[PDB]
Amino acid sequence: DINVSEKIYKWTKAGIEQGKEHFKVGGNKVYFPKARIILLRPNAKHTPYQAKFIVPKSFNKLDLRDYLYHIYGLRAMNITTQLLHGKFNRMNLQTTRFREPQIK
């Protein structure tokens, strides 16, 4: 009777209305996470309703949503991932070249 996308939309609406999570919480509880996230300055392509973070490479989209919600109360309505490349560098020509870190 109702498409699953419509059902997801009502799920999120119900979560916001009831004050609970606007998503489904997982069962793999993590009491003491030592992940750190870095807020970043806005770019010309973003809007005042967007915020970008530098997050762990092994981090996840659902992980960021849950982390923000439970630790700060910030509700991320849509999360999008941008994994950067690592360019080769060498502190001097007489040293092995190695790729820079890949930041997420």
């Binding site: 003491f32 030592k34 750190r36 005042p48 109360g73």
Partner: protein, 159 residues
């Protein structure tokens, strides 16, 4: 597009990434190293699980603030002041001390259970606990009830 059309709340949860709503703290705003010290293992030994959990998350929030400031410092201005870095290192010291304390607490509980699994030590412990205070020469009357409540709550699961 004009920003005059926006009503940005002053309590927006993104302000928790800044200290006193400052873009980047000054040496005066930072806590001086002389007045600051990381937590000690013995001081964390007698903090409840809720207290350790809350301290962990406060440490993480402060580390996030320091992390954004340090990233702006080492990426944009490229300075070598290395103050935020050591401050976050102190917080990390407290964090792993907390982890150690929690592990040792659980292991000590398990070791105590294994010790009292033995019938001999269990009998010895209960007999000594009964002879010392319980069945005294009628000196304590009312506080024996509190002792018994604590006993039934600890040695057994009676609430």
């Amino acid at each position: 597009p004009t920003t005059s059309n926006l009503r940005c709340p002053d309590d927006h949860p993104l302000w928790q990434f800044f200290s006193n709503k400052k873009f980047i703290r000054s040496a005066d705003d930072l806590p001086p190293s002389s007045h600051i010290r990381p937590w000690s293992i013995p001081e964390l030994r007698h903090k409840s699980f809720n207290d350790l959990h809350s301290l962990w998350y406060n440490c993480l929030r402060e580390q996030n603030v320091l992390a954004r400031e340090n990233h702006l410092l080492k990426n944009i201005v490229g300075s070598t002041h290395d103050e935020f870095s050591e401050l976050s290192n102190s917080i990390r010291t407290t964090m792993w001390q907390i982890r150690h304390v929690l592990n040792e607490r659980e292991l000590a509980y398990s070791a105590s259970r294994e010790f009292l699994q033995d019938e001999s030590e269990r009998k010895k412990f209960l007999d000594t606990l009964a002879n010392d205070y319980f069945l005294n020469k009628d000196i304590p009357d009312d506080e024996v009830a509190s002792m018994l409540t604590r006993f039934q709550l600890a040695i057994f699961g009676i609430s």
